[PDB]
Write an enzyme that holds these catalytic residues in place. Structure first.
Site, PDB file in Angstrom:
ATOM      1  N   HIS B  41       0.806  -1.221   0.000  1.00 55.70           N
ATOM      2  CA  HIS B  41       0.000   0.000   0.000  1.00 55.70           C
ATOM      3  C   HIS B  41       0.848   1.284   0.000  1.00 55.70           C
ATOM      4  CE1 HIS B  41       0.220   0.098   4.568  1.00 55.70           C
ATOM      5  NE2 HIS B  41       0.164   1.399   4.342  1.00 55.70           N
ATOM      6  N   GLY B 143       3.508   6.606   9.598  1.00 55.87           N
ATOM      7  CA  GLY B 143       4.782   6.312   8.996  1.00 55.87           C
ATOM      8  C   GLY B 143       5.539   5.164   9.611  1.00 55.87           C
ATOM      9  N   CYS B 145       4.853   2.078   9.028  1.00 58.23           N
ATOM     10  CA  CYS B 145       4.688   0.876   8.231  1.00 58.23           C
ATOM     11  C   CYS B 145       6.038   0.425   7.692  1.00 58.23           C
ATOM     12  CB  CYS B 145       3.699   1.113   7.094  1.00 58.23           C
ATOM     13  SG  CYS B 145       1.994   1.086   7.649  1.00 58.23           S
TER      14      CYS B 145
END
Ligand SMILES: *C(=N)[C@H](C[C@@H]1CCNC1=O)NC(=O)[C@@H]1[C@@H]2[C@H](CN1C(=O)[C@@H](NC(=O)CC(C)(C)C)C(C)(C)C)C2(C)C
Ligand SMILES: *C(=N)[C@H](C[C@@H]1CCNC1=O)NC(=O)[C@@H]1[C@@H]2[C@H](CN1C(=O)[C@@H](NC(=O)CC(C)(C)C)C(C)(C)C)C2(C)C
EC number: 3.4.19.12
Lengths: 306, 306
Positions: B41, B143, B145
């Site tokens: 993503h 942030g 991820c």
């Protein structure tokens, strides 16, 4: 969201751990530039430690006495010297992995990260605080001496702790990286008491602001209070006095959450006086004091280090 | 002595974190050999995430679309490919800091260490477990991820977790390092429920053996019980069934402490049925389940890694 006992990334420090072996003893050392730092009781033998004269024991020893292992690479001592309680071996090779660092001496209430080590190889990292009685509740076994505590700021490693000894009650004592013990303890094997501890009050208020930042709100009330009336209750619960300075430190946390600092104080008051009635705060059934106001800002905002 | 939520030394992993930026999005990547791993993503935009067709969105994109930052050094993508839910960017440079590693898919109950990251720079390390419902109670912000979970064995980094999403209740979901989610969650922004959790029973028994190893003994009794009678009580307290296998895993811990496994079971029974009456176990007022029997052996013995 979420909140965790979080330790600094340990990489910069792992690059500095070595094995130091004198006589029959083997412990950990911190290798910065061409100097290796370790406890001075590496030169004690077994029937020494009861009352040793370090100054005298060290003038008996020579360089080749100290086997320093940097991985599987033998480092050559070209000099030694004592500084309070730490030994300093000067070696032929400079450590190319030397981070930008500092030696800092911290106040009780401050937290840091411990890299627990055995034969110079890291075993784990975890978060500790310096207790009001200059002990720390660590996790240390035989051969853990010379493991260090640290904080990381941007790209700088602030070294603040070296490990030395475990106290009868199972807490731990150690020194700054110039060799001055925290508290009244000595590297001699005679009886020593930790001294009664208190709760780091400022820190429990910081952790209650972390809870509010995270959706836990069941414990705020309308009641307010005064520093005086609040410090009268803390003492019964054997917390530590809240100063005008702690109120100031907790300022941005109060501003981020809209709860006046003294309102959060009257919320702790009620908690001490009524327990928790089965409820929990940030996944905890105890009031938690190993988080500074700096810890909460950093974790709840996202500050990294390079 | 002492016992702490201990995380593996994070050094080997820190050498693999990079910043990955596609379009308006910026998240973390894991750089091993000449491949960088990150959530798929990263190619979603903002008005996509509600129901995106990844296969289709990725065939629209080219290599120069992916800004990969390795410190202050721009890495050049020479290929891309999807694998379940993770993106894989092949770059011109091989990562010279690549540890010996593995990709492993763990069972609920297993613990690991999370290096929380922002713009490819580590922020902290902490210890998590995989909850019976394939969530993890982490500490993640915007942030985060592409931060990864890991175990270290001797010199090998077992990667077991990549971070993807935070669930309404504030728990976290993510994938293995081949891109298969843990649990029934999807990288789409529709409603998703974590599913009710249970207590990792085997682990609370492991943590009670850690307490006994450490001098806490107030909770052992003479009573014994059977797996059946014990599993009848666990279910009321919504613990997880104890299998014949858990009894076996807990074997060396029983042998080190002289408490038969089923004797420690009748001690947990009584604890669930009588609470703790103000007492605490290893500095905790709750029954603690994020420690495996491997965690206790390792911490209480002194196993390091090279
Ligand atoms: C560090 N290498 C080593 C680790 C101990 C063992 C388990 N936990 C630890 O921190 N520390 C020591 O061996 C120190 C050094 C000797 C003995 N010692 C101890 O910590 C003693 N403890 C004491 O006797 C402490 C008091 C009474 C002297 C205050 C034990 C743990 C019993 C070995 C030094 C004190 C010089
Ligand atoms: C990782 N970079 C990022 C971090 C979030 C923010 C704070 N905690 C986190 O883990 N994750 C995401 O942004 C994911 C990705 C978008 C939106 N998203 C979220 O986690 C959403 N949460 C959801 O809407 C989860 C559900 C309902 C889809 C299950 C928030 C936190 C609200 C932004 C992906 C889901 C593709």
């Amino acid at each position: 969201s979420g909140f965790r006992k979080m330790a600094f990334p340990s990489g910069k420090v792992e690059g500095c751990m070595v094995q130091v072996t004198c006589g029959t003893t083997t412990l950990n050392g911190l290798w910065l530039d061409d100097v290796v730092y370790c406890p001075r009781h590496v030169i004690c033998t077994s029937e020494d430690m009861l009352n040793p004269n370090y100054e005298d024991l060290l003038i008996r020893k020579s360089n080749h006495n100290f086997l320093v292992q940097a991985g599987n690479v033998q480092l050559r001592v070209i000099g030694h010297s004592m500084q309070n309680c730490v030994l300093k071996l000067k070696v032929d090779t400079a450590n190319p992995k030397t981070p930008k660092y500092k030696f800092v001496r911290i106040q009780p209430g401050q937290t840091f990260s411990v890299l627990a080590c055995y034969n110079g190889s890291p075993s784990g990292v975890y978060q500790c605080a310096m207790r009001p009685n200059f002990t720390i509740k660590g996790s240390f076994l035989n051969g853990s001496c010379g493991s260090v505590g640290f904080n990381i700021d941007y790209d700088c490693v602030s070294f603040c702790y070296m490990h030395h000894m475990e106290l009868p009650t199972g807490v731990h004592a150690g020194t700054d990286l110039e060799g001055n013990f925290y508290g009244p303890f000595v590297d001699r094997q005679t009886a020593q008491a930790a001294g009664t501890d208190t709760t780091i009050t400022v820190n429990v208020l910081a952790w209650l602001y972390a809870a509010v930042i995270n959706g836990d709100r069941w414990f705020l009330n309308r009641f307010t209070t005064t520093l005086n009336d609040f410090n009268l209750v803390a003492m019964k619960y054997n917390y530590e006095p809240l100063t005008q300075d702690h109120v100031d430190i907790l300022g941005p946390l109060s501003a981020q959450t809209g709860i006046a600092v003294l309102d959060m104080c009257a919320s702790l008051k009620e908690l001490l006086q009524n327990g928790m009635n089965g409820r929990t705060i940030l996944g905890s059934a105890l009031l938690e004091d190993e988080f500074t106001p700096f810890d909460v800002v950093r974790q709840c905002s996202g500050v990294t280090f390079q």
